[PDB]
Amino acid sequence: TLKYICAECSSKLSLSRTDAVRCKDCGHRILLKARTKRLVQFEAR
Amino acid sequence: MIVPVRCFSCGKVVGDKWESYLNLLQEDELDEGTALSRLGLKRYCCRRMILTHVDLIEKFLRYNPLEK
Amino acid sequence: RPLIIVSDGQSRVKDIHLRKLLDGELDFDDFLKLGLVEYLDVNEENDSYIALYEKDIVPSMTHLEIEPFTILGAVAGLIPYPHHNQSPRNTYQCAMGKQAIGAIAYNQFKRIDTLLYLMTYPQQPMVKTKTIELIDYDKLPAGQNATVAVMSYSGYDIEDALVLNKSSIDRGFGRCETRRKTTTVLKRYANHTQDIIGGMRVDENGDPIWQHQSLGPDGLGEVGMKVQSGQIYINKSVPTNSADAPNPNNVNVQTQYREAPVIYRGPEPSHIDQVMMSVSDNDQALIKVLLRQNRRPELGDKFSSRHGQKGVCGIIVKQEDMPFNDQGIVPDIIMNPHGFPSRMTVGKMIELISGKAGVLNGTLEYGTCFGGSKLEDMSKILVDQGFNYSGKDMLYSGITGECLQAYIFFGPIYYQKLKHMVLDKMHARARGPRAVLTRQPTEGRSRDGGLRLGEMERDCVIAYGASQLLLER
Amino acid sequence: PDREKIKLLTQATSEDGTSASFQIVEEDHTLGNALRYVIMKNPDVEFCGYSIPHPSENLLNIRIQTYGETTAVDALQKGLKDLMDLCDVVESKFTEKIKSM
Amino acid sequence: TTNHVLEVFSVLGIEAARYSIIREINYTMSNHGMSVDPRHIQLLGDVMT
Amino acid sequence: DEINTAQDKWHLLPAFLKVKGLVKQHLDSFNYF
Amino acid sequence: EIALFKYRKARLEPGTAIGAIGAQSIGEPGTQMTLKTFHFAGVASMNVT
Amino acid sequence: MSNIVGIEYNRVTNTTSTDFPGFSKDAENEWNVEKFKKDFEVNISSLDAREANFDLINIDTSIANAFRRIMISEVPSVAAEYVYFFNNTSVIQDEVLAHRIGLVPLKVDPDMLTWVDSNLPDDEKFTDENTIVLSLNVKCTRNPDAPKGSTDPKELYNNAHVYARDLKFEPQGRQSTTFADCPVVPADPDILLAKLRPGQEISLKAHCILGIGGDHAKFSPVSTASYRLLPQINILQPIKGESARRFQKCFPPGVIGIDEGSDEAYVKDARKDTVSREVLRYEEFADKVKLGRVRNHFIFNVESAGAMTPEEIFFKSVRILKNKAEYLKNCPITQ
Amino acid sequence: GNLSGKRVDFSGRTVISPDPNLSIDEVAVPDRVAKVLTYPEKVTRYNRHKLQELIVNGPNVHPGANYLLKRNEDARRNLRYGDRMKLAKNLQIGDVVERHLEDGDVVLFNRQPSLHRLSILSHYAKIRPWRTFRLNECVCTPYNADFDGDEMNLHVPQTEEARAEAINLMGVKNNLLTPKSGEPIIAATQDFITGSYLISHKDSFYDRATLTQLLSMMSDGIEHFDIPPPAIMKPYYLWTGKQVFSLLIKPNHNSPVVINLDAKNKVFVPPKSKSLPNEMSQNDGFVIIRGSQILSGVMDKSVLGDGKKHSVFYTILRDYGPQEAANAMNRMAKLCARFLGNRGFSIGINDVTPADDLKQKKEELVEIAYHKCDELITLFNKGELETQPGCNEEQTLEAKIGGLLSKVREEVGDVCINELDNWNAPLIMATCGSKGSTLNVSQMVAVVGQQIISGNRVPDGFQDRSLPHFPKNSKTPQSKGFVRNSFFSGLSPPEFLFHAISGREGLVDTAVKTAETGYMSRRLMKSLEDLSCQYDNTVRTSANGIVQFTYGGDGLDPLE
Ligand SMILES: [Mg+2]
Ligand SMILES: [Zn+2]
Ligand SMILES: [Zn+2]
Structure with missing residues (x-):
């Protein structure tokens, strides 16, 4: 599902539940979430 | 943030007249009035769109989160 | 404050001292060493005698002031020509400029705080000030350059009410966005347990159910989706048995989770753009999600005028209305001309004249205090372009086609959109606690009664003499 | 035949023709003014006035009032046929100037 | 006539104290406009005494 | 072109705010502390 | 007829809460006071409230 | 009433047309189609691809205002209505970027489309003769041949600035040959919709339908549609000399002129006058000039957005304003 | 410790907006708060035809209902979870529905710093678009409205007896006067005065292409007017601007409105200091109205709208009831709003x-x-x-x-x-x-x-x-x-500082005045509370102890 994004090196990493939540490349302590792969509908008005 | 596509009052497309304005500012050095006059718009409406506009996206793209 | 010393006939700061200052060296603190300027105190300038300008050199003088418009502060320097208005309309604007919304910082998309408002297309002001270039207000402006025909139109503008233009706010005049924060923490209780997150339950081919169709496989609201009423954007479950302290045993009782998620509630739907995981200081998980909502101007949203002429929106008027000044410029906001004599803001009237003649020969003008652009040579710029010297244009009415029998003052004014929209103030209650129409919980020392019936309102219905309305209410 | 486009209000009209009112739905100041001018040029019509009661609706109340021997339901049909004639005059003189140049 | 109502009350009596209090209120309001249709002032000057 | 005196005196205020800032009343106290 | 009808309708109707009307008709002009220093004297002889 | 009007220094008089039978004792100016066909005519100053300027004489303000009003609303046009996004990972939010795709003008004839019926479900409103699909797919890439310095985002960044030319029309449905003669393009391909950085990608799909300009500003077929009454300067007491040259420095240089080796000034090409009435504050030019404008003459100046030619917008407005009058006379008046 | 206190069900609070197309006795309620603020209606012989469709429409469609209480008191069953079409079919005669707020319902309308008894009026409802409590501006003067984003409260009565005590002796049409002096406090306002000075100006002469439009913009179409013969004839048929206000007072023969007052307006010039006519003035000046016909003088604040005892609507109110004065106020309020946008x-x-x-x-x-x-x-x-x-x-x-x-x-x-x-x-x-x-x-x-x-x-x-x-x-x-x-x-900067001191003096005397908005009026209310006139024309106390034998020495109501 591609669940993690580092806030410094921006490496597309992902790990499962309770697996030492940090970055496996740099070592930053906070992580972002990527945009979904589904389809969102908007109105151009 | 970015230059608007249409002007607010009448609706003339001013989004096509920003890069050609910045080209006339740096090279072929003119003041803002004449270089904005020989660019299209005659009215002071739709002239206000290019004159009083701050470009925030050039400063916003220095904080790119998808790279380092 | 630092002032300039004079020595018994004239100023110490000569012409040769100021040529070096704008050419690199000999800056400030190199004028304190050479004895040209000095700091004076409040009870120490009582033993002084200060001139205002340089055409005032009397041999009985001791000091000379640097600038007269230093008396206005940092927020108070946003007003163009403050010495033409009256002083309460210079004070109210100091409470309205801080409430205006716009660009906040260069990392305003990179931070998560509890509430901030943004502007989609901010524009720098037409007439600047010599004190707004130093505080860098022209890099992060908060407002919109409208075009204003000052006239009475459609009758929905009687006192403190502006009418707006459809097909002008449809093209991005006043589009804002509101970002709110929801934070949760996953507590580690003392009796060896956690509160876990998860979900993804289905029911008869629905993938997932209606209350769940904003969550991913993790259980957090993914970026890009929309959230509406009672749908859940953070699915949280806490253990129901490990609240007290049952001292640690190896019994299998940890499969008891009573779920208690957070639920979005609101009139109009929002969108999820950021969610962040943290492993904060004492090894404890933190979840911060941000929800943004794009709002457009409507009936009830208030605006200012950079002079204290605050007012609410009256009606969004069609574009085929709003008389059109034969070249073809439709006004953006029409303002009632009756707000001028009782409030005495004529410095606003100069703002159009130094604004309409500022657009033409491509120069953003200066409306600084005790100076700025002179009204004499700004009407000369306005008159050789083919316009009136006083900005009065003649209009052609929209609903009837014929001319208007008075020349109508037309030109651009830097307006600005405030807080205090109508979408988060509509609060209603039918019966019982936890009212059905709940406003956003940001009061901040502003409890103005609420949905109550005070003793002052009980005394009004005694004066009518109604006895059964008392028992009903 | 649309029976909801134009109506005739009951508690506004007198007897036998004269002093009638009409309610037209989904209309703005365009046909109101362009039809107020043509019916006023009928020399038997002496009170022709349109109005919109509320701006966030789509109503148009037009009142036609004569003296006599012309029913106002016929005075509306007379001033609505002449607008077709004016639009025939406008698009015929304009087309030949595009053609001839 | 003095401004002090109790000074009139200690010398003149009850009935001469209300006739001063219906005009001292009438004086402190007619110096600004704001007519308060003096039957209201007479009702105020009667419930106090 | 030509340097005046009543107009170039204005330039004392930028050169004041470049050396010591506008938020110096909070910075200088914590730096002295 | 007009002079008798406008007088017969002008009487105070029984049941009117006339204390509540008189209490609000006095206090509501009282809530629009600024300072307004005046004097019942000559050239600034006395400061009166 | 009191013909060609006067411009006063503090007001303007004679506003109402008032040419109806009932203005005076004699029944003057009836309808008389044979008189209106004789008196009304049209001149044309210029016709360009996106700008038209023409004149109408002997005609009321009311129906000319009607034409000016329903040039904007009732003339239909096409614009982007619904936008479907894929992985928008740029800095612009997906409501701001969706709002700028609707505002661009598309260059296609709107007579090739059908009106959307809103009572149908979502998979049945859109069909072949109803929808124009546009597709955008831009991914930014770092340019490997980097220059000697970081100068501008044009260099050292491949396709960092998207444009309106990147909206690729997809041939939808079945009839991919009806639009094969003229595929739909924007009226100006240089519209900066977004700025990008590497790692970012915009992928979307827009469904363009037909609509009127009174519903939203994006369906407006014309940028500016307006008129001006022809001004007129009736000069009397023919003064000359240094005052004649002072009389010239006020007005624009092509509305009055000084004769070369002969007598006083005159009026030439009064069409180019923008009325600023600055000769009404001198006290030298008080009873020596008479400003005004003629009420019958109209100068229509239309500048379109680029979807259709401006010589079609006026004819389509006359056709629309004709059709709503014949639609009303064929309806029963219901009590 | 003497704060607000009580908490009241079925109320709302929203900002206000201008709307002169709305009548003076109405407040337009949006369709988002007129869906939870219900009214309990008992079904009877005369509402069975409506309440069935009202139940069938449901809670989401606006002419609908939310809850339902049976006659035998089963429960308070809401119309949301099941209970479709068949529920409206039975509808026993003792049932109580809770219907949505509709057009014509009695509602009371309040502003929170309540000064006097004209701060809580009663209105009719009207269901509209965008979410604000818009109301007319002829009634904003007793509320002290300066709109600029001010919030107001709205309460609906929940019974048949308190709903009648709001529309009869508490509503707008029955309270055109203030009881403080008898003067009209709730009358024409700001832009409705300058729209009347420009019509009734002497230099205005109309025509049937303009007078007809003026008569049709004041009564939104439907009204039968009788066009008088003009004041100017055979050269040019011209109707004066004083024949418009002469016409809106009495449109046709059916209205019995005959108005015969005369009064002087604001700032006035003596005619010749010898002429016994008061209306031969150099300006317009003194106003003559004889039989619903203005003979002279403009319509400013003194003659038209808020002010003294010589108003036009005051004369209509004393002579021809409150409903006709309300109709004339609505007529001029929707005349001026349409005219002043077309004059400029x-x-x-x-x-x-x-x-x-x-x-x-x-x-x-x-x-x-x-x-x-x-x-x-x-x-x-x-x-x-x-x-x-x-x-x-x-x-x-x-x-x-x-x-x-x-x-x-x-x-x-x-x-x-x-x-x-x-x-x-x-x-x-x-x-x-x-x-x-x-x-x-x-x-x-x-x-x-x-x-x-x-x-x-x-x-x-x-x-x-x-x-x-x-x-x-x-x-x-x-x-x-x-x-x-x-x-x-x-x-100059010393002049600027001298003006700033005098401005901040008056600016601080207003912000501290809001803390003393009702302190004297509430303490004075402690004693002048339980006093009412009995049927023997005596004003007494609650314990029947008499305080004054006749009111004011003569027994006259100062309101009338
Ligand atoms: Mg206020
Ligand atoms: Zn990392
Ligand atoms: Zn424009």
């Missing part, structure tokens, strides 16, 4: 600039008054002066300089109005009603004068002087609080 009215920088003649008199006459006060300064240090008996030698110098500097601002303030050209906005707004006086236009154009604080002039901010820009022992007017520049020319 602006102010601009042109209407504030002195025309090169006032500047010479300002340069001359002020320097005459500076010389006649500076001679008292050089006489003050010549020992003593002629001391006035009311004060000492120091306060007799303040009073004379204050009197001369108050006299200099009115002799300049009256030579500016005479050289001021007509057809401008602020002189018309000072000649007519709503806002602006001669003081405001003389303070914009000619001169601002003598910024005073706390009664006297400004004191010494430093030792022996006010500002450090003036010498010690300087009692000159430019040093001690006399500005001399108008707002068009621009203030």
Whole structure:
């Protein structure tokens, strides 16, 4: 599902539940979430 | 943030007249009035769109989160 | 404050001292060493005698002031020509400029705080000030350059009410966005347990159910989706048995989770753009999600005028209305001309004249205090372009086609959109606690009664003499 | 035949023709003014006035009032046929100037 | 006539104290406009005494 | 072109705010502390 | 007829809460006071409230 | 009433047309189609691809205002209505970027489309003769041949600035040959919709339908549609000399002129006058000039957005304003 | 500890907006709060045909209902979870539904700083678009509305008996007067006055292409009008502007409205000082109305709208009921809103600039008054002066300089109005009603004068002087609080500080006044509360102890 994004090196990493939540490349302590792969509908008005 | 596509009052497309304005500012050095006059718009409406506009996206793209 | 010393006939700061200052060296603190300027105190300038300008050199003088418009502060320097208005309309604007919304910082998309408002297309002001270039207000402006025909139109503008233009706010005049924060923490209780997150339950081919169709496989609201009423954007479950302290045993009782998620509630739907995981200081998980909502101007949203002429929106008027000044410029906001004599803001009237003649020969003008652009040579710029010297244009009415029998003052004014929209103030209650129409919980020392019936309102219905309305209410 | 486009209000009209009112739905100041001018040029019509009661609706109340021997339901049909004639005059003189140049 | 109502009350009596209090209120309001249709002032000057 | 005196005196205020800032009343106290 | 009808309708109707009307008709002009220093004297002889 | 009007220094008089039978004792100016066909005519100053300027004489303000009003609303046009996004990972939010795709003008004839019926479900409103699909797919890439310095985002960044030319029309449905003669393009391909950085990608799909300009500003077929009454300067007491040259420095240089080796000034090409009435504050030019404008003459100046030619917008407005009058006379008046 | 207290069900609070197309007895409620604020209706013989469709429409469609209470009290079953079409089919005769708020329902409407009894009126409802409590501006004067984003409260009564005690003796049409003085407090307002001064101006002459449109914009189409013969004939058929207000009072023969008052308007010029007619004035002046026909005079604030006992709607109210006065108020309020957008009215920088003649008199006459006060300064240090008996030698110098500097601002303030050209906005707004006086236009154009604080002039901010820009022992007017520049020319920094002090004085006396918005009126309410007139024409107390034998000595209602 591609669940993690580092806030410094921006490496597309992902790990499962309770697996030492940090970055496996740099070592930053906070992580972002990527945009979904589904389809969102908007109105151009 | 970015230059608007249409002007607010009448609706003339001013989004096509920003890069050609910045080209006339740096090279072929003119003041803002004449270089904005020989660019299209005659009215002071739709002239206000290019004159009083701050470009925030050039400063916003220095904080790119998808790279380092 | 630092002032300039004079020595018994004239100023110490000569012409040769100021040529070096704008050419690199000999800056400030190199004028304190050479004895040209000095700091004076409040009870120490009582033993002084200060001139205002340089055409005032009397041999009985001791000091000379640097600038007269230093008396206005940092927020108070946003007003163009403050010495033409009256002083309460210079004070109210100091409470309205801080409430205006716009660009906040260069990392305003990179931070998560509890509430901030943004502007989609901010524009720098037409007439600047010599004190707004130093505080860098022209890099992060908060407002919109409208075009204003000052006239009475459609009758929905009687006192403190502006009418707006459809097909002008449809093209991005006043589009804002509101970002709110929801934070949760996953507590580690003392009796060896956690509160876990998860979900993804289905029911008869629905993938997932209606209350769940904003969550991913993790259980957090993914970026890009929309959230509406009672749908859940953070699915949280806490253990129901490990609240007290049952001292640690190896019994299998940890499969008891009573779920208690957070639920979005609101009139109009929002969108999820950021969610962040943290492993904060004492090894404890933190979840911060941000929800943004794009709002457009409507009936009830208030605006200012950079002079204290605050007012609410009256009606969004069609574009085929709003008389059109034969070249073809439709006004953006029409303002009632009756707000001028009782409030005495004529410095606003100069703002159009130094604004309409500022657009033409491509120069953003200066409306600084005790100076700025002179009204004499700004009407000369306005008159050789083919316009009136006083900005009065003649209009052609929209609903009837014929001319208007008075020349109508037309030109651009830097307006600005405030807080205090109508979408988060509509609060209603039918019966019982936890009212059905709940406003956003940001009061901040502003409890103005609420949905109550005070003793002052009980005394009004005694004066009518109604006895059964008392028992009903 | 649309029976909801134009109506005739009951508690506004007198007897036998004269002093009638009409309610037209989904209309703005365009046909109101362009039809107020043509019916006023009928020399038997002496009170022709349109109005919109509320701006966030789509109503148009037009009142036609004569003296006599012309029913106002016929005075509306007379001033609505002449607008077709004016639009025939406008698009015929304009087309030949595009053609001839 | 003095401004002090109790000074009139200690010398003149009850009935001469209300006739001063219906005009001292009438004086402190007619110096600004704001007519308060003096039957209201007479009702105020009667419930106090 | 030509340097005046009543107009170039204005330039004392930028050169004041470049050396010591506008938020110096909070910075200088914590730096002295 | 007009002079008798406008007088017969002008009487105070029984049941009117006339204390509540008189209490609000006095206090509501009282809530629009600024300072307004005046004097019942000559050239600034006395400061009166 | 009191013909060609006067411009006063503090007001303007004679506003109402008032040419109806009932203005005076004699029944003057009836309808008389044979008189209106004789008196009304049209001149044309210029016709360009996106700008038209023409004149109408002997005609009321009311129906000319009607034409000016329903040039904007009732003339239909096409614009982007619904936008479907894929992985928008740029800095612009997906409501701001969706709002700028609707505002661009598309260059296609709107007579090739059908009106959307809103009572149908979502998979049945859109069909072949109803929808124009546009597709955008831009991914930014770092340019490997980097220059000697970081100068501008044009260099050292491949396709960092998207444009309106990147909206690729997809041939939808079945009839991919009806639009094969003229595929739909924007009226100006240089519209900066977004700025990008590497790692970012915009992928979307827009469904363009037909609509009127009174519903939203994006369906407006014309940028500016307006008129001006022809001004007129009736000069009397023919003064000359240094005052004649002072009389010239006020007005624009092509509305009055000084004769070369002969007598006083005159009026030439009064069409180019923008009325600023600055000769009404001198006290030298008080009873020596008479400003005004003629009420019958109209100068229509239309500048379109680029979807259709401006010589079609006026004819389509006359056709629309004709059709709503014949639609009303064929309806029963219901009590 | 004497705060608000009670919490009331079925209420809302929303900001307010302008709407003169709405009547004076109505408040337009949006369809988002008129869906949870219900009204309990008992079903009977005369509502079974409506409540069935009302139940069938449901809670989401706006003409619908939310809850339902059975006759035998099963539960309070809501119309949301099941219970479709068949529930409206039975509908026993004792059932109580809770219907949505609809058009014509009695609702009371409040502003939270309630001063007097005209702060809580009652209205009818009207269901509208966007979410604000818009209302007419003829009724905003008792609420003290200055709209600018102010919130107001809205309460619906929940029974059949309290709903009748709001629309009969508490609503808008029954409370056109204030009980404080009997004057009309709730009447025509700001832009409805200047729209009446421009129609009834003497230089306005209409025609059947314009008069018909004016008559059709005041009664939104449907009204039968009888066109009078014109005041001008055979050259040009012209109807005057005073024949429009002559026509909206009495449109046709069916209305019995005959109005026969006469009164003088605002600022008035004597005709010839010999002529016994009061209406031969140089201006328009004195107003004659004889049989619903205006013979002379414009319609400003004195004749039309809020003010004295000689109003037009006051005469209609005393003579021909409250409903006809309400109809005439609605008619003029929707006339002026349509007319003033088509006439055009602006102010601009042109209407504030002195025309090169006032500047010479300002340069001359002020320097005459500076010389006649500076001679008292050089006489003050010549020992003593002629001391006035009311004060000492120091306060007799303040009073004379204050009197001369108050006299200099009115002799300049009256030579500016005479050289001021007509057809401008602020002189018309000072000649007519709503806002602006001669003081405001003389303070914009000619001169601002003598910024005073706390009664006297400004004191010494430093030792022996006010500002450090003036010498010690300087009692000159430019040093001690006399500005001399108008707002068009621009203030000097000592003039700017002197104006800022006097502005912040009056600005702080308003913010602290909101803490004392009802403290005297509530304490006075403690005793004057339980007093009512009995049926023996005596006003008594609650314990029947008599307090006054007849009210005011004569028993007359000061309202009527
Ligand atoms: Mg307010
Ligand atoms: Zn990392
Ligand atoms: Zn424009």
